[PDB]
Amino acid sequence: KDFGGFNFSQILPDPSKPSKRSPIEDLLFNKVTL
Amino acid sequence: TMSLGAENSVAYSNNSIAIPTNFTISVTTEILPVSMTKTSVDCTMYICG
After folding, report:
1. How far apart are CA B15 and CA B33, in angstroms?
2. Can you tell me the distance from the alpha carbon of A34 to that of B8, in angstroms, rounded to the nearest whole number?
3. Contact criterion met (CB below 8 Å) for A14 and A23
4. CA-wise closest residue to A6 among B19, B10, B12
5. In terms of Cα–Cα distance, which of B19, B8, B10, B15 is closest to A3?
6. What is the DSSP secondary structure assignment for residue A30, as one 8-state letter?
7. What's the rounded Cα separation, in Å, for the pair B12 and A11?
8. From CA A21, how far away is CA A11, in angstroms rounded?
């Protein structure tokens, strides 16, 4: 991830967790309760 | 289980660009309904006649 200094780590999916979601998508699923 | 499409990991480098050489003119189509039939039902003949 050499994008010239830009850090899309909060939006790109996280492989070191299950369901393969980004940090922000994780908090979007944990903050909406069915 | 459905495939969501082909996998196309594209060759991002920090100093390489891809530029088109040729083009295609493509005509696609798109269909939109704009109107209904103008039915009209009287109650009195329907319910009673």
Report:
1. 47
2. 35
3. yes
4. B12
5. B15
6. H
7. 18
8. 8
Distance CA B13, CA B16 (A): 5
B31: left (phi over 0), alpha (psi -120 to 50) or beta: beta
**Token pair for B6:** 């082909």
CA–CA separation, B35 and B39 (whole Å):
12
Pairwise CA distance, residues B14 & A7, whole Å: 15
Distance of alpha carbon A29 from alpha carbon A19, whole angstroms:
11
Give backbone dihedrals phi and psi of A32, rounded to 5 degrees, phi first: -110, 115
Which residue in this structure is represented by tokens 């493509």? B26
Amino acid identity, position B43: C
